[PDB]
Design a protein around this ligand. Sequence first.
Ligand code: GSH
Length: 672
Amino acid sequence: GLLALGTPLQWFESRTYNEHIRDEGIEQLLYIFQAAGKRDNDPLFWGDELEYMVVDFDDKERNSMLDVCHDKILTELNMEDSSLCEANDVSFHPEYGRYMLEATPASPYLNYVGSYVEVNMQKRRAIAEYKLSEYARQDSKNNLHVGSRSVPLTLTVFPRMGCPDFINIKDPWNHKNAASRSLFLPDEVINRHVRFPNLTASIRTRRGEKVCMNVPMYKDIATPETDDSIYDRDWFLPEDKEAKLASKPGFIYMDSMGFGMGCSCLQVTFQAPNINKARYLYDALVNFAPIMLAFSAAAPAFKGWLADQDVRWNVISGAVDDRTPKERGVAPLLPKYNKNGFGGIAKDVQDKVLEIPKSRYSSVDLFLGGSKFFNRTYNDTNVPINEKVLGRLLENDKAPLDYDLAKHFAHLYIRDPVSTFEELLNQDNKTSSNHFENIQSTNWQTLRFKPPTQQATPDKKDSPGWRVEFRPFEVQLLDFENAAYSVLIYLIVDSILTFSDNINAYIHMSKVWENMKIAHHRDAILFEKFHWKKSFRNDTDVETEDYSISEIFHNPENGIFPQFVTPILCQKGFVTKDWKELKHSSKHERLYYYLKLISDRASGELPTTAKFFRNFVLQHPDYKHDSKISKSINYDLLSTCDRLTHLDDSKGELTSFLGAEIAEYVKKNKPS
Ligand SMILES: N[C@@H](CCC(=O)N[C@@H](CS)C(=O)NCC(=O)O)C(=O)O
């Protein structure tokens, strides 16, 4: 569906409600516990979300741009084409990008659904393409977008974001971009739902400096010493003068929310049998996140530069980092504007400000605990909390919480609201969870623990229960890939839920955070090592050693395959002892190829999308050995991507990306 309409409050106007919003949200959370805390036997309903970028291929000029003009597609698919969607069990939603689409199945899958995930993804893609060709026909007859061809591509990152000629709008700088005030992204990159410009404005104002994300540059033989795309400008104060102080030699400089939230990923949500199992699951997935981040890398470039990392994560992390310099333990870049480092924080609350170590978009901070292997000492990192929120979740007449669970909520609640409508200031806290969602939904982490609504009382069997979202996977080009990774997480989750008495996955959170930095490094999948529990079938044992991705997927003692995937496939009867027996299964041949794709990438036999893009740029005739992605490199790159997305081996590129065996396999067999 669409986000329903409202008037956003600008930050200066909204900040005087921070405490009102937090208070009432907590009350709502208490009502939700009171009402749904006792749900049980909830079934394993689950679903993926994909995010797409509509690219306008201008073949005559050899230029691929983001198409910021067919954005009505999201309204049409939710009005007069909504019946197309439902008949097809798909659903479409807006995302940050004006050029982005988000789409999910219309109903959750129930337990194992084989190839249906891929089938449902393809339908999402076909309905998008269909709508695009309808616009192409209308456009033609009104002489609009001549020589343009729009295609939706599931790219993690647009390699030419905020570079010249990257959006299909003539002369986008002939007016100002008051929302982001970016040097590089005109505000037309932003979806027109008021929420998105608003979040963009509030975070910038609250911070009192532009968001800033410095990404190490790939260091090739002729690479400039600095990011020579930086220029000086005079539209905005303090912002146009920040760049020279915020940038750093040998780093791509990014300065706007759309560089981050203008990226795409694959997200998967699961419903646990009840809250306790949801905690158990969420805790167990914590260290899988850095690992699947590295394993799925798809983002080797930003703002036109080959980067020295392969994932989006830290970029999205900085793109919505509302921490004032005081909050980050640092001097403002421009002290006469950012007054004492408190940016836009109210004068009457500066005394209560905290040094906070991590962006509101960052890895899980705390295990929730509550299961037999948990021990509070595994939460061994710096996690500031809202003491007031802790107190009240601890001591209240609706649903008093255990201290570990109270601490998680208390940590999420150290942030202010960054987007609030005036209509909605006063809600009925027994029926509404909108204020809790304000803060829940703007703490973006590697997982999300999702309480349900106050309507989900245990007798409502069909309501959503307690859920866990697995958020780190970079999105891939092919529906085949994205289905594989969706099923991978599915099997891992099912393994975790079926074997809960036996699987102890606890490790010290600090190792996980370290894992999150390693997962960024260029070619991490191919040689880096990550702290990984040495055994799972083992009460009290929280020892790790350092293992490559290959070992992490394949070690008998503690690998993803022999300890998660294979065991659940045995017990469901898909195989008698090994995941590879599936090559010969009648019912399950496709599951073998998903797993083989996963196994082969985890061991370096086949390349990540990030790798394949890095190679392509490096081996391009026009590449100038300087790390720059030209209009023309970007065009062929995305043309390749387009063919790949479509299983088109006419140039041997699918065979080069997937290898012969999988390439033939997917060309010769549609999902059913
Ligand atoms: N594109 C993001 C995931 C999607 C996301 O976090 N979207 C933001 C956009 S502001 C959001 O909060 N979406 C839900 C909403 O806007 O209500 C990623 O790769 O992590």
